[PDB]
Amino acid sequence: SGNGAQGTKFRISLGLPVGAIMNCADNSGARNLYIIAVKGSGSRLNRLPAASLGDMVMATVKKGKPELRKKVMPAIVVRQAKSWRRRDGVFLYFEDNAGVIANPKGEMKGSAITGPVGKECADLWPRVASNSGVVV
Amino acid sequence: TLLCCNCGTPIDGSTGLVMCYDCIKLTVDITQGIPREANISFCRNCERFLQPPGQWIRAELESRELLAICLRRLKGLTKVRLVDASFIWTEPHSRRIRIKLTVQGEAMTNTIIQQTFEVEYIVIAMQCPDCARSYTTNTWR
Amino acid sequence: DLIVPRRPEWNEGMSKFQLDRQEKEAFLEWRRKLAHLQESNEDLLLTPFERNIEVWKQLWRVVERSDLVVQIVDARNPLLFRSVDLERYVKESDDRKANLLLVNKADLLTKKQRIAWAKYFISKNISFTFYSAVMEKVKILSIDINIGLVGYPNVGKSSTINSLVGAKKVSVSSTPGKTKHFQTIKLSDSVMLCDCPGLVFPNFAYNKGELVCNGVLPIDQLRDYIGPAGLVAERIPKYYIEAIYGIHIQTKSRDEGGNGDIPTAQELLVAYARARGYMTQGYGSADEPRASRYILKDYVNGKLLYVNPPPHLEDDTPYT
RNA sequence: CUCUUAAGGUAGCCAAAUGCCUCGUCAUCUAAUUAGUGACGCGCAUGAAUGGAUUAACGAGAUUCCCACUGUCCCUAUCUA
RNA sequence: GCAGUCAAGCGUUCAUAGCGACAUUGCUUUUUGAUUCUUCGAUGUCGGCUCUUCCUAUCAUACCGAAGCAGAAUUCGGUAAGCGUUGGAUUGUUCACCCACUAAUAGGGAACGUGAGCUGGGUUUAGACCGUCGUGAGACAGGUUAGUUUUACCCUACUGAU
Ligand SMILES: [Zn+2]
Ligand SMILES: [Zn+2]
């Protein structure tokens, strides 16, 4: 899981499994990302792996800028719609699931992340913090 | 109005770029992880070559499907992209196949560059075993 | 400049062994010459041709058995396929020569451009005949020793054979990969006609930034799909495209200067297959390598018409 | 020139519900396709009222993909007779 | 299929840090074959889903040892079966093949585990089409499409309860 990640994240509720088509939040030219796998996910029989906020996934672009699609690229989940619990008691959820295309080191490919970004995603990667306007 | 940051000297543009052209030429590789020499089998009677799991493809020398079987040989050429693998002449006797390959590898950030690199395909002598057992008198159908 | 293989002499004597040996070896020297030519022009652009022994042997056999050739090239691009070393190769017996080249599929050229093409076809003194299979001509008719019918494929050269005799001698196809292992025709029995297989000639320009996806490359078997896409895009403007197809494609959604006017074919193939309903496996996206084949095999037929000017760089000869 | 007692697969069509080899070859769709489609054809063993090719409309016919939708599934839980 | 036995040579003159000759001894039933011994007054016939247990011939994890082991990464071997050993595209598939994550995606057995547990895609009746064969009825271990999956309330076993 620690592929360029800064620290260790708490267990956010697993919002979106494989096959989930989340939006694309940065100006990379992509528009949606089709999650095929999650980095650092445990293997149980029939349990298909799920990605929470701030997770690094392997995904595929399904729409926009044909230089980008038909290849597997790492993404980082910056918004989810499953309500998760922060340890200071608040439950919260966004209105859409949205990720950001990055390299395997964690450095982004775009230049600006439109829309809010969860604190648990912005803290774990110093490059997603540098490119996000609204945090939570 | 920048500097290379690897060697330091040349001012490069604002078109979207990286360190200098000699620096990406000598330091940065996008063609790593390939063997520049490769062996392939053959038969002198039926003139049939193969990838070692699979059936013979029934092509001849200086063909088009030689590009297909050499791409289907496991190199790094499949994932690094591909364009213009056109054939280069070799002496028929010298028993070599020379293919130039041009991949468009991705740099440190978003900048796609051209590449010229070469791999030699040397052919060894075989006898097509599945043909040798056909002459051998085992059970009939 | 140097594009043909050359067989000097027969010498009539004996010894088929060395008659095969001198022809094989001779053929190989031409391959070495072509590789030297290849280092020269940058490193990448290679002329389209073939370099096997047998299908060139099948021309080496028939050139002197006919001792005159006639040509079948398409009228939509006739400047490029006049190979330099073939009218020069009907020269080497010092007999009746000067092949009298013919250009076919010439129905597609009107009166305002057949005469403009005849200006080029006369002024630089090149042999020329106009036929929909010296200035006082409009087009020859189907009314108007061995004849060598020479042509690279899909020019309708087997549809020419079904328009002078009515015999149906060789089999034409849609893909250009059929004509091989020649078939002579006996008609008007004092005269003979021989056949030539499909031989593309080496032309030293426009090979990878090409325009040769009109008669050469397999349209059903391609793996670049954006070159011919933009090639179909930049000519045949948007109004004629929507006139033929009826589909609404664009009113310049992206306003930046990457496209402007005369739209490129990354919003054309998606706009064609969003109407033809061709979708991918996993998301609803109009697949451009599925739309590109039905665009290319509709353009190279003659429906989406385009002809280049006589070889001077002009603005626009066709007017839809 | 012929060889069997007649003729020697014509126009078309195709790994087709007909192709053994065979998961045929090339391209394409997919991150990945023994599937699907297009193309090729010496086709074990296609073919012209033992009817061939193409076809709008129609089908509780067979097949592939997409959009929408969902407990089919991740991953089960609860309620009613 | 695996284990040892002498190991020509190769591995930079380095017979063994590993691999490879000729021939050679031998094992396990987890497979190809050979008989016909058991069932012909029927032991429900492939695969998948589900679930339990066992073996070691160890893929990962634990601890060691040895290398052309400087570190890093590898290789090989010893104890070791405690604990794990996946998500998908195509195919009925076992098998295979890619994609991807992972510490790792090891090999097997229990009537080739398991149909009064399920499913019925395949095979394997009757309908029909093609191709080849046959004069013909018809054949094909060839292709294709449709095609009823029954009973526990008894004894034991197990799970709980008097
Ligand atoms: Zn520099
Ligand atoms: Zn062979």
Side-chain angles (χ1 to χ4, degrees):
Chain A
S1 89
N3 304 137
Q6 186 70 22
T8 60
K9 57 187 284 277
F10 297 98
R11 195 196 184 272
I12 310 171
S13 283
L14 290 188
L16 64 163
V18 295
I21 306 179
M22 51 181 181
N23 296 345
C24 191
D26 59 331
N27 56 342
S28 169
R31 268 173 63 161
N32 56 347
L33 304 162
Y34 171 81
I35 296 172
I36 77 173
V38 190
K39 279 263 204 211
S41 89
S43 299
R44 158 78 205 202
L45 183 68
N46 288 325
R47 171 170 312 176
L48 48 94
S52 69
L53 195 84
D55 282 333
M56 158 153 290
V57 311
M58 304 304 272
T60 310
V61 175
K62 288 288 175 171
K63 173 186 299 310
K65 280 294 289 291
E67 54 172 27
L68 280 154
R69 45 198 318 278
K70 306 195 62 55
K71 59 175 283 185
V72 163
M73 39 183 57
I76 294 166
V77 185
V78 312
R79 292 191 288 275
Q80 80 176 51
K82 179 60 178 37
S83 78
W84 76 95
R85 178 184 169 266
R86 292 196 168 151
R87 288 191 69 196
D88 47 305
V90 284
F91 278 82
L92 76 156
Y93 56 96
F94 290 90
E95 58 177 60
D96 55 344
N97 317 303
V100 165
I101 287 164
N103 64 5
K105 291 179 70 67
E107 316 163 11
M108 282 178 44
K109 202 212 154 65
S111 295
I113 302 182
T114 68
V117 159
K119 155 179 94 71
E120 301 103 320
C121 185
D123 205 309
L124 212 74
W125 314 86
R127 198 60 70 93
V128 187
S130 299
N131 274 345
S132 66
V134 179
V135 174
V136 204
Chain B
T1 62
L2 58 89
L3 289 90
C4 164
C5 93
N6 204 327
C7 74
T9 54
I11 299 108
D12 314 316
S14 48
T15 184
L17 48 82
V18 72
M19 56 203 67
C20 175
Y21 288 175
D22 185 274
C23 276
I24 192 177
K25 180 137 174 50
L26 268 299
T27 71
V28 166
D29 46 351
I30 49 174
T31 176
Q32 67 279 10
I34 55 172
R36 307 308 181 110
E37 176 266 333
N39 286 318
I40 46 173
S41 185
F42 210 26
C43 198
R44 266 52 194 170
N45 161 236
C46 342
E47 313 282 36
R48 218 112 142 275
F49 16 42
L50 83 163
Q51 309 132 192
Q55 303 105 48
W56 298 252
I57 206 70
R58 291 265 39 162
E60 63 272 30
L61 215 63
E62 196 256 322
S63 313
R64 195 236 64 78
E65 279 63 25
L66 299 175
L67 283 196
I69 55 182
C70 296
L71 162 57
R72 220 177 322 272
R73 287 285 167 146
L74 176 46
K75 315 318 179 184
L77 80 176
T78 169
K79 0 121 204 212
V80 325
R81 293 156 218 196
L82 264 166
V83 60
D84 282 356
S86 299
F87 263 115
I88 296 306
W89 180 91
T90 306
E91 311 124 319
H93 222 245
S94 66
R95 62 180 61 86
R96 310 292 292 263
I97 295 96
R98 167 154 35 237
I99 319 166
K100 58 147 192 280
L101 301 175
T102 60
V103 304
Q104 317 289 335
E106 301 114 315
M108 295 294 174
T109 300
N110 306 7
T111 55
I112 305 309
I113 212 63
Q114 58 100 49
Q115 198 157 50
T116 69
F117 65 98
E118 192 259 2
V119 164
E120 261 178 291
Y121 265 103
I122 170 176
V123 52
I124 55 188
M126 258 250 111
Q127 74 277 132
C128 252
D130 331 31
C131 318
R133 286 138 207 153
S134 158
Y135 322 129
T136 295
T137 172
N138 263 8
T139 185
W140 76 103
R141 294 296 187 274
Chain C
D1 295 306
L2 59 92
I3 42 186
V4 75
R6 303 186 59 95
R7 169 38 41 185
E9 280 92 48
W10 287 115
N11 281 37
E12 254 291 323
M14 65 298 290
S15 51
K16 341 191 181 188
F17 190 59
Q18 54 94 5
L19 261 290
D20 171 77
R21 275 188 71 254
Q22 73 183 7
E23 286 214 357
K24 184 201 159 248
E25 275 17 303
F27 145 83
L28 234 189
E29 192 201 35
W30 171 46
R31 165 98 64 89
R32 273 74 154 245
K33 293 181 169 162
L34 238 11
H36 291 310
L37 184 178
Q38 235 310 255
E39 242 212 319
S40 295
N41 287 337
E42 291 177 350
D43 290 345
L44 318 177
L45 185 140
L46 177 63
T47 59
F49 77 114
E50 67 281 357
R51 40 172 48 189
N52 55 340
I53 318 166
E54 201 51 54
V55 83
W56 280 117
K57 184 73 65 65
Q58 288 308 124
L59 183 65
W60 272 4
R61 184 253 197 208
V62 307
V63 285
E64 69 272 343
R65 290 282 293 275
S66 177
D67 63 50
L68 67 150
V69 302
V70 302
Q71 305 288 138
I72 304 188
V73 293
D74 51 353
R76 281 196 304 193
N77 204 272
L79 52 94
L80 195 45
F81 316 124
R82 181 191 172 267
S83 79
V84 195
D85 285 334
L86 175 68
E87 58 268 0
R88 297 311 298 164
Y89 207 71
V90 279
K91 276 303 161 287
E92 62 98 30
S93 71
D94 315 309
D95 280 271
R96 326 290 187 272
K97 294 292 207 175
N99 64 299
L100 306 100
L101 204 165
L102 160 60
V103 192
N104 274 336
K105 208 143 172 153
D107 199 351
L108 322 178
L109 275 172
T110 77
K111 299 153 268 164
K112 205 141 166 152
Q113 33 191 354
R114 271 185 283 117
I115 316 299
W117 260 109
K119 180 179 68 65
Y120 169 67
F121 264 116
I122 285 154
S123 46
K124 289 188 177 40
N125 203 266
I126 45 187
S127 297
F128 79 110
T129 320
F130 270 67
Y131 183 40
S132 46
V134 79
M135 254 307 277
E136 41 186 29
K137 58 176 61 168
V138 280
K139 194 158 299 298
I140 73 167
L141 312 154
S142 295
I143 288 305
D144 294 298
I145 199 51
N146 188 353
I147 288 93
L149 209 55
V150 183
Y152 82 104
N154 83 2
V155 290
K157 64 153 302 183
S158 297
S159 184
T160 60
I161 306 187
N162 288 29
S163 48
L164 83 170
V165 55
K168 186 161 41 203
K169 287 299 302 311
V170 289
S171 74
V172 77
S173 65
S174 76
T175 58
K178 184 61 205 154
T179 174
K180 193 163 162 51
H181 292 325
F182 80 115
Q183 174 45 65
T184 63
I185 306 96
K186 184 85 168 261
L187 64 93
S188 159
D189 310 277
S190 305
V191 309
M192 164 53 47
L193 197 148
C194 75
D195 207 57
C196 167
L199 300 185
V200 289
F201 300 137
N203 308 334
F204 66 103
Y206 295 93
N207 290 337
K208 41 193 284 163
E210 79 258 15
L211 265 69
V212 307
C213 50
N214 44 359
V216 179
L217 272 303
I219 277 169
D220 294 89
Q221 297 171 355
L222 85 166
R223 42 185 318 156
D224 57 298
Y225 84 85
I226 63 183
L231 211 57
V232 164
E234 67 204 289
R235 45 205 69 163
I236 311 101
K238 186 212 69 178
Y239 283 81
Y240 201 50
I241 285 295
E242 60 87 21
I244 292 174
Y245 284 134
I247 68 182
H248 194 185
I249 68 164
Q250 206 57 257
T251 311
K252 200 191 179 176
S253 44
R254 178 172 178 169
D255 205 3
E256 277 62 25
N259 184 82
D261 271 26
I262 307 193
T264 178
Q266 72 213 79
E267 56 273 354
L268 165 71
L269 295 195
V270 71
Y272 182 56
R274 272 163 75 246
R276 286 309 160 270
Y278 298 143
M279 292 319 156
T280 66
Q281 301 221 344
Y283 206 75
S285 294
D287 38 0
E288 312 155 8
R290 177 85 40 215
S292 62
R293 289 219 275 253
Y294 298 79
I295 289 304
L296 284 199
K297 79 212 304 160
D298 205 49
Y299 153 76
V300 307
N301 267 35
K303 307 304 142 209
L304 263 57
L305 87 172
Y306 174 76
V307 58
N308 55 357
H312 184 72
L313 293 92
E314 218 188 357
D315 189 26
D316 42 352
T317 316
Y319 274 84
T320 61

